[PDB]
Subunit: 124 residues, 4 copies
């Protein structure tokens, strides 16, 4: 199995109150759903990503990333967010991320297409 | 089908000479392989992502994103990159992205865990 | 005077234990010194920046930014960090930032020149 | 003098058609004005920043950064941009940057406060 397959798989919550439901596969896959507490979003969106299934054993975190395109059966916000970060195990397990949200825009507006931020996910 | 299913599917090349091989599914999925011309990487890595399969029709680009975890059968760089951007169709089709590369690090080094950059992909 | 001239001027501390000493001028200027608890840095470095001296009065934060080039009389790390963020007044005043650290590198290494992160500064 | 004092001082133009007028001081200071071809901006804005006045001599670029707060006598966009990058000398001298634009927002909107992008400046 991936070293942190069981540690990563499950339900996570960020500081905005969003809900990140993920399954980590033995092959390095991340699959699941994302529900954002903010923005032009309602209900669950498909996500997919990858993680390092054989991380270092020196106390370093486990690198990972995932994408949500903000289209589902309810809404289409013509945008996608990618989260890049690491899982940190332990009693207070965390996934610490930085993210890039890109909106589909015309070429004249490309300069203002991308938001950057940071989300921390916990199991509680 | 996704509006830009055929436009996105195929082989793309960025300004570093890296090769991005992707299939866009009707459901919004991106699957394929990435081969980086630079860094701690050799041969192909699995990628997965998402794209807006019903973009706006006002000339705006098509938002998308994908992730590579830098582990394959040859090397493990304990890191993952996410690319966030948009596909722009036309005679000179492009995927314009910004990216976040996170390395698995100890908590004392978390402040220096993440690189940011920008890649432009073309069909030639 | 700037609306938050007095609120911004003073000594601030971030989550790494770094010390940000700043004077906000009536004209929108920020001047002062930065001392980083981490990285290739020792003692104080010159900083300069700008802030919105007439912010909105609807509860929004006060936008600002500053730069440190990491050369002083002790060390030269051939790099510069810019912090971009906002000051949020109140009992628990904060400056919330995201930052970009660029290292001087050869053109072959330009893709790995820039780190991104986020620092929160408090008065305690 | 700074190694690239003369190389940096002058008028620069980016890919959007914006105009960056800068003087590099022997002490590492950057001062000047910025005029953006895009966004909520008109005429010139004050800028200030820092650069490495004693860069490496191995062909590496010269790290630098600067800030503009988007208030002048004509408009106040309640925002600030920081550019972080490097100057690359030679026949086709360039300043390659990544930038963070933060808007002053209420705490409920802090997640969408910051844009990220990249500008390349040339002498022509
Ligand atoms: O909301 C969305 C989809 C939901 C995004 C939720 C984000 S993911 C990163 C973060 N972690 C999280 O848990 N939740 C948030 N996609 C278009 C994102 C439009 N803006 C923001 C909201 C909005 C809704 C309606 C009308 C205008 N805005 C982005 C701001 C912006 C920046 C630059 C130019 C123009 N607009
Ligand atoms: O290379 C990797 C995997 C390959 C990454 C390729 C990147 S994806 C974004 C971009 N688009 C692309 O087409 N190609 C590049 N993963 C660890 C990334 C270590 N550094 C860089 C190289 C290196 C190799 C060996 C030893 C040291 N470095 C990152 C620099 C850094 C930043 C902060 C702290 C420490 N190190
Ligand atoms: O430390 C510096 C100057 C100090 C930087 C302090 C940072 S500002 C943002 C943050 N807020 C803060 O309060 N403190 C930190 N400038 C070169 C920054 C080299 N690396 C990190 C340390 C290091 C010291 C010696 C040898 C190798 N590293 C950056 C990692 C990197 C990324 C990509 C490619 C290569 N390296
Ligand atoms: O324009 C400004 C000041 C000018 C900014 C110019 C930028 S600096 C980086 C770049 N290099 C350059 O040469 N030129 C551009 N400051 C508020 C920036 C509001 N948005 C964009 C324009 C706008 C004008 C009026 C109404 C709405 N927009 C930012 C988009 C955004 C993102 C997230 C949430 C909400 N909005
Ligand atoms: Cu290893
Ligand atoms: Cu973080
Ligand atoms: Cu948007
Ligand atoms: Cu705006
Ligand atoms: Cu639509
Ligand atoms: Cu771009
Ligand atoms: Cu690394
Ligand atoms: Cu380093
Ligand atoms: Cu106003
Ligand atoms: Cu922040
Ligand atoms: Cu460095
Ligand atoms: Cu490295
Ligand atoms: Cu040196
Ligand atoms: Cu760049
Ligand atoms: Cu804004
Ligand atoms: Cu918006």
């Amino acid at each position: 199995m991936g070293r942190d397959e069981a540690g990563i798989t499950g339900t996570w919550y960020n500081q905005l109150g969003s809900t990140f439901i993920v399954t980590a596969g033995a092959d390095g896959a991340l699959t699941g759903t994302y529900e954002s507490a903010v923005g032009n979003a309602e209900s669950r969106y498909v996500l997919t990503g990858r993680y390092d299934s054989a991380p270092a054993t020196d106390g370093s975190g486990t690198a990972l990333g995932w994408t949500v395109a903000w289209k589902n059966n309810y809404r289409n916000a013509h945008s996608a967010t990618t989260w890049s970060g690491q899982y940190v195990g332990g009693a207070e397990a965390r996934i610490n991320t930085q993210w890039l949200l890109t909106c589909g825009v015309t070429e004249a507006n490309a300069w203002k297409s991308t938001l950057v931020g940071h989300d921390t996910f916990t199991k509680v």
